[PDB]
Design a protein around this ligand. Structure first.
Ligand code: ADP
Ligand code: ADP
Ligand code: ADP
Ligand code: TPW
Ligand code: TPW
Ligand code: TPW
Ligand code: MG
Ligand code: MG
Ligand code: MG
Lengths: 547, 547, 547
């Protein structure tokens, strides 16, 4: 009677759930899992820190709509990875953190085992569900639970604890076959009732100055044609959130993005589609919303997200595709949004875009570029070459890139997210490049970048087509804050370093861009090469604002 | 009537408790605390990731015996820091993590605040106590509690939550000066009963083959002369744990370190001074202890550490200085350890040191050094220059450096610790340099180094006298593992990179060392320069072992 | 080769740690543990709800100074018991909650096992340490850890999770003998340094108007002669906290209890001995302390209790016996406290006691007694018969009994404690009677009593010499609050019921007392009988105050 072991049953269970990639860092007790994963023909990305392996898993989950999988070791390794897990859960990104753990007997009596921690219990606040698979016969069920919990309802992070003793357990191949199974429909459709849709339809029809807010929940739903048909048929102005950019092209004629404050402040009805009324929307109150209570339509899969901040007139609970599909039929043949309202917002968009175009064309000293004329180059490149992932984080480097770099394609812009995390950059680059098989451009603030900068070597080792643009202004916000005391450097200062040399240290290609023309020629060559590159864009230290 | 604010009451409260240094990363809502700390004339070290600012804080606590203070932002920055607090708590290092947090009203209803998290609750498993100062009037009491919890009993990490709204509250200077106070005797002496000492004296006096195990709790106590006087007066051979190296000079004639296996297996009485019978001691059982229950004497400030793993025949609960002083007087004038026991171990030690000296002088090809002849250079240098901090982490780079590099001075060796953390290196380097005012050498595994390597820029930015030695063997354990499939790199491989170039990129000095002679010249020149350096030591990819 | 099993190894380990009593409620999976405990000759008290079995365990711990042991079942049973555990931890009472739990495999995958819960993790905030014993070979060590954690440092609650699969495991009797052991010195003495004692001695010597506050930490320490010698030699007025009553007799001439507010408000030095500066001491501020900062001496075993509320001038950290013993020698031959100060407080005590004596002698209608003339009877009885435990809880029934019923003997008064728990009554009665083997009187508020009233049957079933006096005023605070609406009873009303009938329902003796003479004759007969009794004392519904 032939046997298989815990390593292989786990490998098999994972593949049966359509996982072919893991991002992690090896060591006791999980190194042979990673090796056997690779021997079997599946792929494993080894990082330099588990946090970044974890941010990679998280964004692979957003892009693909199946859980990104992170593999770590016990205690300190697990902790690093659980920080990324927390991030996924907050952003609604499906992810599974697999971590090796130590001996139950010793850990439960707190005796001081190798890398001792109840990792299952410390994971709890940072994930939807935290499980432990103790027995080889329970791996198929455990992985099914983890995948279902990650992708169903509101997607998010799940932790699966893999005690060291799990892997060496044996069981007959005949029994293993009998236990291995594929979950039916792990991310089911959830459809709203007629009267929920009808209440929303009547709000929108009687709106005088409506608006549609698209969030990354809408972008994640992968129903781009449905969402676009709703916008185009209703005639309603729309606004995308940071990662909702590209769902409809950012230069779509119904986009009120360039006149956002005016549109939010002046609307009567606001349709939230896969967008929370959280801090990124000023909680639906204050000066951004005209100091009044709007009448909201909200489409979300989480029922208790409704009324979380402001009362919602028309709550529609269900998956966005189902809900939008039904709303479109309820609104069929109704009048389009008021020409006076839509034309007024278009006039503000054109006037604001002309104002921005002047900034981008302006001239600056060599090596002292500003955020406008530097990011104008990236904008032009991205309009001509839209099938490229855009990774973005920082302060001035984020806000200006979101404003300037138009996305024409959905789920391409990958940014700091709901928590404004600095640290997501290089991990996002590795994952985006692994799952798309297409180029990646990153626009990194120099402070932002240093949270994950050592992963430059990971990008080189896997020869990925990623181009990292460092907005090297020499600091957090600004690069010129005076010494507080004689001989003491200010806390916001960073070395205006040769990040291009760092990239070349690990086999990558380095550029220094002192002018827009130099940034353009470097970017065009980098992306064309298909090789790991870094462009050190030299930005005026005083160009940024703090706020 | 004149007023002060939360910022300054916190600065004054910290200063009153003898804090003059913080390690952190700035941003909302805590940047202006960092600035005013510097304005007032105290020092702030800005890092590239909060985890490494936290590892610095942790080892500053070990070295000085007063809490290392780390300052982070809310949610994601807090999470990064709290991973280091965990480490502090596990290693018994006094540390305070100060983090800004968001708005109470919004976080408590989970509405989606900027960087939303119950950071106070999330910290609880990773610290001794988790507090929050909500009001200006409680800052001095709050900081007093933090410093007492951190340094008293078993020392460890404390989290203090600093809601954004705390800093802008105002109070009169006269009221604030009445509230501000310095705690009396925050880490008190705790003296054991006479019969506790008598029970231990009895076991030692009747031992045939006694051994003293010194742990890093003994080193932390800073009573090096007392511990040395106990060892010399009794004539008992001793064994240092990883960071107890140098407490007594590693070349002391009574050291049994080079014959640890034999000494532990054959002893009858084992005297634990500030050392746990945890995984680093194989839990007081198995082959390493000759498959028998030794008679244990244990000195520890934590009462319930006794009988955690094995029954302790002579528990002595109290601070190590107090206990050792009493034990010495209790053993005064008694005969020394058996000369055939201490002679047997000395013969083993000399024979084992002879075998290692043979390896350290062996010859290897250019760019293909092994761990003996490369680290033999570091050994010779540290014998000549002992007033230098030795930071160390990795697998082969750790085990071989702990074995080969003799520490003649206490609290100089700073390594991975109880959790075997990869990531402590560059943070430890910064704190060590800061608190000692003297040179630091780091012997880093190349995998190890990648967990904090971006902090090279921090080391350069503060112009610290730190020399980083990368044991560049091309991977985890080894750098030569075959491609598991055509064109697919193995998971344990790293780029054999130019880490020297990376250092040069931020204004440091980079060296490549292909031979022991090149490593020696470069190490001597680097330490003597007083400047940030990195030596890329080229190790044979097949040199290291795995299991 | 002869075998033993998990049940017996646990029984043996428990007895070796000097436990002979358990309080609990049986059922799956722990009923045979309770039976075998009894078969072996040890005693088991079965309650009607685990909470009250738990309050019994907690107070057995206070009285004896070794952990009270509660035995419960999984999920809902455990939860009930953990509520008592939390109470023990808050009051610093040594206690161990043993709970059966379900199958690891099923619970860790949250599949819906019988009584599913991670009881080890939900215990965490309510105890000092929460452990789980998975393996038969680890029971001796697990029980040692639990006992050491309960009684060492600051005493408190420990949870030990006993998975169902533990009990049926086998091991050789030869190996069981080898693993069973008795912890050496689980509650060690901890002695303070000379200079800590000397700083306190100098504060007390230079005090103009000193005072000693004795708390239940001092009463728990069982060093009654030491504490009394300190008071009598220094000549310092003293004040006892609720359960510190009787440590010195309440009518001791140096007691300033009857003039408490004046003494706290007018002192310059305050010596806290085993007493926290918490809500029961108004946090050392406000009108009770003259709106000024006192200079404090505090003796406590928990080092970080110091400066928790107010700055402490003379912190003495150590066990009370050790600390008081040393302080007494430092103060030897020094002048006694000022006659003008001690005589002034005595004059207020006498005048206040005369004022109280008039209230107690006053006449009331039959069936409408007040708190003074009713509790005056209990007072007289307790002076004549002091070797009786006094259990007490309620609002008016607590405050008036603490004021009126003088305790002449230590650790006899057992009350609501730090949390002001209603619910501790009948459990306290069962435990007090089990551990003392002497009579118990309970003074219960009628609302208070109903939290544990069904345990009257437990008291009868074990034929315990307990007399429950219900202060039957017909409500919470007052028994006469008008109906808020027509036909609706007010929320503070209770049925003025025949609690004497309820007692007789289970074989006990019932009395109704309508007058002081009737209460006196019933109490004298009840206590003389040595049988379970209840006196239904009919109190005027309008006699109480709410505040
Ligand atoms: N397929 C889906 N159907 C419905 N709602 C979804 C779906 N996927 C995600 N969501 C919801 O979308 C929301 C995403 O909001 P958020 O992350 O704040 O986006 P943004 O920051 O772009 O506004 C979440 O509330 C989540 O529950
Ligand atoms: N001042 C002190 N006096 C006595 N014991 C101490 C003191 N400081 C720390 N300890 C104890 O020392 C121990 C440290 O042991 P550990 O971290 O395992 O060292 P190692 O890993 O070197 O064996 C802890 O159990 C801690 O309670
Ligand atoms: N043997 C002991 N030695 C020193 N301190 C003790 C001892 N036992 C208990 N304590 C301390 O006594 C205190 C009890 O305070 P508390 O329960 O508030 O008493 P009270 O309510 O009567 O003031 C706790 O802080 C506890 O740490
Ligand atoms: C994990 C974490 N730690 C700190 C912070 C706080 C922060 C917000 S923005 C920022 C850096 C801004 O500087 P950058 O150079 O990137 O951008 P620029 O203005 O163009 O110069 C930090 C540190 C966050 N958000 N997350
Ligand atoms: C936070 C964390 N993540 C992973 C790990 C697991 C590990 C233990 S040792 C090691 C690296 C070994 O390679 P290195 O190059 O440093 O040493 P060597 O080539 O043999 O000289 C890892 C990743 C740990 N301990 N902590
Ligand atoms: C577990 C719990 N739940 C509620 C409460 C709140 C409370 C405080 S006092 C009290 C009852 C007071 O009435 P009683 O009849 O006992 O006394 P008297 O004035 O003489 O009529 C309650 C319910 C507490 N403390 N604990
Ligand atoms: Mg910057
Ligand atoms: Mg290596
Ligand atoms: Mg009542």
């Amino acid at each position: 009677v032939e046997l298989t072991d815990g390593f292989h049953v786990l490998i098999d269970a994972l593949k049966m759930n359509d996982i072919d990639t893991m991002y992690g860092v090896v060591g006791i007790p999980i190194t042979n899992l990673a090796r056997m994963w690779q021997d079997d023909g599946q792929r494993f990305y080894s990082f330099r820190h588990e946090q970044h392996a974890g941010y990679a898993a998280s964004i692979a989950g957003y892009i693909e709509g199946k859980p990104g999988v992170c593999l770590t070791v016990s205690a300190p390794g697990f902790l690093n990875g659980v920080t990324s897990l927390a991030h996924a859960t907050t952003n609604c990104f499906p992810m599974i953190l697999l971590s090796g753990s130590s001996e139950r007997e010793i850990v439960d009596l707190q005796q001081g085992d190798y890398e001792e921690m109840d990792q299952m219990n410390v994971a709890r606040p940072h994930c939807k569900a935290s499980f432990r698979i103790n027995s080889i016969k329970d791996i198929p069920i455990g992985i099914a639970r983890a995948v279902r919990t990650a992708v169903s309802g509101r997607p998010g992070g799940v932790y699966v604890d893999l005690p060291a003793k799990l892997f060496g357990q044996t069981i007959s191949v005949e029994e293993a076959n009998k236990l291995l199974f594929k979950p039916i429909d792990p991310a089911p459709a959830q459809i709203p009732a007629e009267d929920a849709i009808a209440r929303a339809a009547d709000l929108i029809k009687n709106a005088k100055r409506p608006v549609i807010m698209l969030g990354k929940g809408a972008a994640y739903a992968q129903c781009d044609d449905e969402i676009r048909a709703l916008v185009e048929e209703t005639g309603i102005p729309f606004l995308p959130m940071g990662m909702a950019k590209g769902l409809l092209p950012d230069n779509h004629p119904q986009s009120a993005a360039a006149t956002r404050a005016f549109a939010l402040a002046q609307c009567d009805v606001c349709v939230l589609i896969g967008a929370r009324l959280n801090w990124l929307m000023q909680h639906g109150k204050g000066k951004t919303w005209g100091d009044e209570l709007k009448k909201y339509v909200q489409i979300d899969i989480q029922a208790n997200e409704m009324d979380s901040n402001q009362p919602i007139a028309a709550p529609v609970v269900g998956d966005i595709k189902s809900a939008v599909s039904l709303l479109r039929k309820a609104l069929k043949g109704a009048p389009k949004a008021d020409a006076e309202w839509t034309g007024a917002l278009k006039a503000k968009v054109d006037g604001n875009k002309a104002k921005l175009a002047g900034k981008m064309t302006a001239e600056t000293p060599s090596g002292m570029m500003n955020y406008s004329n530097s990011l104008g180059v990236v904008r032009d490149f991205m309009l001509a070459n839209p099938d490229i992932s855009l990774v973005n984080e920082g302060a001035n480097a984020l806000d200006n890139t979101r404003m300037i770099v138009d996305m024409l394609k959905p789920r391409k812009r990958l940014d700091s997210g709901t928590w404004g995390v600095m640290g997501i950059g290089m991990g996002y680059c590795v994952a985006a490049a692994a799952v798309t098989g297409k180029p990646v451009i990153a626009v990194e603030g120099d402070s932002a970048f240093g949270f994950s900068g050592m992963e430059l070597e990971t990008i080189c080792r896997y020869n990925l087509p990623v181009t990292v643009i460092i907005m090297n202004n020499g600091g957090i916000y600004k690069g010129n804050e005076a010494d507080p005391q004689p001989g003491v450097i200010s806390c916001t200062r960073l070395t205006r370093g040769r990040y291009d040399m760092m990239m070349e240290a690990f086999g990558g290609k380095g550029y220094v861009a002192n002018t827009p023309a130099e940034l353009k020629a470097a970017l065009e060559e980098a992306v064309a090469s298909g090789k790991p590159c870094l462009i050190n864009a030299m930005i005026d230290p005083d160009a940024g604002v703090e706020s």
